[PDB]
Amino acid sequence: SVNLEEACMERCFPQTQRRFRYALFYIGFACLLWSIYFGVHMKSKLIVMVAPALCFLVVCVGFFLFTFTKLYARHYVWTSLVLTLLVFALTLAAQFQVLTPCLSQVGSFSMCIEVLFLLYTVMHLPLYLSLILGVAYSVLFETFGYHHWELLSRALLHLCIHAIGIHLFIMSQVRSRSTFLKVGQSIMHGKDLEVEKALKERMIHSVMPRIIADDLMKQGDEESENSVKPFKMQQIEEVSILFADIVGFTKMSANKSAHALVGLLNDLFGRFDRLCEETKCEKISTLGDCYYCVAGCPEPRADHAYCCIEMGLGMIRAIEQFCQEKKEMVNMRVGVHTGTVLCGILGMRRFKFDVWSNDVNLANLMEQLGVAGKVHISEATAKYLDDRYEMEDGKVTELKTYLIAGQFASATFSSLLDVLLSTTVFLILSITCFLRYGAASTPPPPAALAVFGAALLLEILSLVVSVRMVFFLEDVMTCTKRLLEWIAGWLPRHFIGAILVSLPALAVYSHVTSEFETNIHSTMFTGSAVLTAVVQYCNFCQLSSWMRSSLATVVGAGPLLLLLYVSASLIGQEVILVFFLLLLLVWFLNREFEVSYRLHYHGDVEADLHRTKIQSMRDQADWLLRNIIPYHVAEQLKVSQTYSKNHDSGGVIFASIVNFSEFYEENYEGGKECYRVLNELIGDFDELLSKPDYSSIEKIKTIGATYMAASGLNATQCRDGSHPQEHLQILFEFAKEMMRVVDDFNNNMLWFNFKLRVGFNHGPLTAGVIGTTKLLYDIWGDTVNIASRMDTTGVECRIQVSEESYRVLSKMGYEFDYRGTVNVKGKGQMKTYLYPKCTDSG
């Protein structure tokens, strides 16, 4: 991730800067304490040492204040480079003048070590370059110390110090990269999440008015949103139910492109939405040739009739400007009635907040008998119309009828590696201490080999724990580990790992069981041992911080204060002070590192949280879309802006509850108990669509007792084992199905049985989507209004199937009783067929 690993450092500068600075602080105190030794007791016979230390001090403080410089951005890698080169020079220069017998070589060694761990941590050197220059410094240091096996010992000291430092580098920078990538993912998750939220909100307000949508967006009732994974209805009265149905409708819909026609339609509909929003008139929808609105139902309005009729005149202006614009001989009849309407939301598929009354049906009948240019109004309209407009008693030419016309890197991963490393290095520790015996083929002390093997097996058992945990080999028994990990918790793991990391102290002490203080070679050698030992405790940064630190502290401390009284006098003082320094050093280092680990944990949590949140949000939005849109069109707009297509043969069935409005009887608060029961049976019909064979059944929409279905539409590819016109058969299957369903629901309908009439047709039709920044998608064609009047002229318990639909369904196993010949507007007296073969009388 080249430019991305670049961005890492782009943001990951300040931590490196501050760590560098505190390391500088360390170095300063280091040369400080060297000087205070060499000035207090010994080496006061030559002051050529304090001057190098002090010029080191001054160049380090120059680093200190220069770090803040503006020209420090890309000016840091080679900075670390030159600085550590400097430090190396100081070390070896102080180192050479030795091998006289007055002072320990390990002091220089100790420096070399802590130096190189600093070089490790903050310098952020190239993996290979870091390693190689480090090991180079190591080897040149051990060589220049030369002025049969002790040298090999010091060498292994180098090697272990390498291994620890190098792993520390690798884990630190993988921590960096991982945390960087993770926080990036988190913020991108936040952003595309709120994007998803905005999108689903667009979908909400496109399927719910601002009043009710904004009501549900504070989730007053959480059961609504639980269903989204709870309906309130209001008998809002004194509202203006307004309709407008296209005249010249079937005409203008004769020979268009079947797509651009929809386009100009949607254009006019944007005009009409403008009219709604300007007149504060709450539009409802469009049923084929007929657009419709109410006027301020949720926000109750009194001049609702006024803005109603003024928006009507506005739409009149719109249609005139368009028909004179697109050169069309088209208009639309208009019809409005006012009064009471109970409004609410039922249904779980393609459903909506809608409205119900006979005032609705009154405006409906008046509109179908209405004329373009003069809205057909009733008395309830004219009663507070106040006739400030072009009132006209427009009588029906065939009921108070009027007209108006104007005016990687996991937690175990880490423990895996660090355990492995602790093990191997404690083993090379063991090699080192052992090889004290070079000629003594027999080892006198038994504790050495004893606890050697002991710690060895402890390491190997922790090893196999880790390796069969990760690799999942499961030789003996796996449920064992399952019950076993339950005991390894945040603190138990703490103490066990504490033992594991603390052991090398007693490991080297097994050799301390032997007499040493006589042999100062042995003495200083053991000092080298114990310091090279304490170096490691910075390792398991997944473990304790405060307790880990204190542990390393006391374990380094104790035995040396013991040797203080076990006696080569003031060299104890100097070594204990250097231990003090390196103590506070590693203290704050692994402090920083465990802190980085803490923040990694933290950010990990919240990032996965955001992932889950946007997952849920996206999924809920998609669920809502599937409520509101089909799939093929989801693909169409997923790739385009719109879609429309003349589908020349599909079925269409309409179902209307005959005895609804009477057992609707309004003794109650609108009888909305009955409306609860209606949402019950509606959800039952949704279950009906929830059938797999009823996946290809396109339930279009509904208006209270209305129900609209059509198929042969998403049937875009017909396979050989499928007939292109079978969908009518499964549609009629669904018809008899829902008949059975209402029959069963009636048995549970308390002291009542609801009945419905149904009318069917099939043939020509055309799909097209409307809403952009809105959402409306509908089908049209003569088939629509044909089945409309069919169900309109129907009778319950009998299935009025049109002539040609009767024919095409009879050959598919359905037996129809010839109802008769009924007038169809646009078709005149049309031959009709009920399905049930005298299930009723006949």
Author numbering: 97 to 197, 217 to 262, 278 to 359, 384 to 552, 566 to 574, 780 to 939, 976 to 1250
Sentences copied from the publication:
The enzyme is weakly activated by forskolin, fully activated by the G protein Gαs subunit and is autoinhibited by the AC9 C-terminus. Here, we present the cryo-EM structures of AC9 in several distinct states: (i) AC9 bound to a nucleotide inhibitor MANT-GTP, (ii) bound to an artificial activator (DARPin C4) and MANT-GTP, (iii) bound to DARPin C4 and a nucleotide analogue ATPαS, (iv) bound to Gαs and MANT-GTP.
Our choice of MANT-GTP as a ligand for the active site of AC9 was based on two considerations: (i) we have used it successfully in our previous studies of membrane ACs, (ii) the overall conformation of the AC catalytic domains stabilized by MANT-GTP is similar to that stabilized by ATP analogs, such as ATPαS, based on X-ray crystallographic studies. Due to the low molecular weight and innate flexibility and pseudo-two-fold symmetry of the full-length AC9, the resolution of the AC9–M reconstruction could not be improved beyond 4.9 Å. The nucleotide density stretched out towards the forskolin binding site, suggesting that the molecule may have been captured in a previously undescribed orientation within the active site. Based on the available structures, the G protein-free state (nucleotide-bound state, corresponding to AC9–M) can transition to a partially active state upon Gαs binding (Gαs-bound state); subsequent binding of forskolin (Fsk) fully activates AC9 (Gαs/Fsk-bound state).
